[PDB]
């Protein structure tokens, strides 16, 4: 029993973190086989940050312009190139701790584990969701750039995020491991702002299914709703419209609990219009949206507490 925002064990990733230095700027990089990936802004000094031309700044660097340290071991850079917003530094050694991996570009609403790192040394791990507005609500300080986000399936690490910046509202933005940003953000210190965000409806539903699997049905009701009538309430409360695809994704959870998706939507509509009246769900006083249907199946028992 119980339900926690759970991250994946981080060991397979801790072994790939290194420190990359260019001039007086130091940040984290990811060492897989014979390549080190890191934010291209490592080649910027504070004055380059407002209007950097990376093509121009980079052509002025040589392989030895880059210092790569793995533990207390110096790696030697023997090649470098830019791929969108990342640099790929080829080094003379292959990481012997490289896990099986893949690079994936996750979709909004999906979740992943973040291994916060500083100076190539991992310091903490936590779970988060890619928000609909393409930012994540992480916890990062100066020196955290190059920290990565990932998911683990069996023993394959699927890397999906590299940290690059913080926006004014205190939220974070970054790229997939091909260096393409999530969202309309660019890697320069100009005026940028996260767009308006929305609650991830599919996840709130999944989490209500988790609450039932764990033995709680207080919020259910005798009603049902059409997708359309639900969406009128969703718009009013700034929730993503529910789609038929979302209803299909919730099939397994619905089958495990015996609660039809639209009947659960009716329960949600009621929680939205009436509040929780001093009550909690899985320990929370608010409707949680950072657990996907997959996160629920992963964590909850496959047997409902009837």
């Amino acid at each position: 029993s119980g339900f926690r925002k759970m991250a994946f064990p981080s060991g397979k990733v801790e072994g790939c973190m290194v420190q990359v230095t260019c001039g007086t700027t130091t940040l984290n990089g990811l060492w897989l086989d014979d390549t080190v990936y890191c934010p291209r802004h490592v080649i910027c000094t504070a004055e380059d940050m407002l209007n950097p031309n990376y093509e121009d700044l980079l052509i002025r660097k040589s392989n030895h312009s880059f210092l790569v340290q793995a533990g207390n071991v110096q790696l030697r850079v023997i090649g470098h190139s830019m791929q969108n917003c990342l640099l790929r530094l080829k080094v003379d050694t292959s990481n012997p701790k490289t896990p099986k991996y893949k690079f994936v570009r996750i979709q909004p609403g999906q979740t992943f584990s973040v291994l916060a790192c500083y100076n190539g040394s991992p310091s903490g791990v936590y779970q988060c969701a890619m928000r609909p507005n393409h930012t994540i609500k992480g916890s990062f300080l100066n020196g955290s750039c190059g920290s990565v986000g990932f998911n683990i399936d069996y023993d394959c690490v699927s890397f999906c995020y590299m940290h690059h910046m913080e926006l004014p509202t205190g939220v974070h933005a970054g790229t997939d491991l091909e260096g393409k940003f999530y969202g309309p953000f660019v890697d320069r210190q100009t005026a940028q702002a996260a767009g308006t965000d929305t609650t991830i409806t599919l996840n709130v539903l999944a989490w209500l299914y988790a609450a039932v699997i764990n033995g709680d049905r207080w919020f259910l009701n005798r009603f049902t709703t059409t997708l359309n009538d639900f969406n009128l309430v969703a718009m009013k409360y700034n929730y993503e419209p529910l789609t038929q695809d979302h209803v299909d994704i919730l099939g397994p959870l619905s089958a495990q609990t015996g609660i039809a998706v639209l009947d659960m939507c009716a329960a949600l509509k009621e929680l939205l219009q009436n509040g929780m009246n001093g009550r909690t769900i899985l320990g929370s006083t608010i409707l949680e949206d950072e657990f996907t249907p997959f996160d629920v199946v992963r964590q909850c028992s496959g047997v409902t507490f009837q």
Partner: peptide, 5 residues
């Protein structure tokens, strides 16, 4: 105001 980490 984007701040690069």
């Amino acid at each position: 105001x984007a701040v690069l980490x």
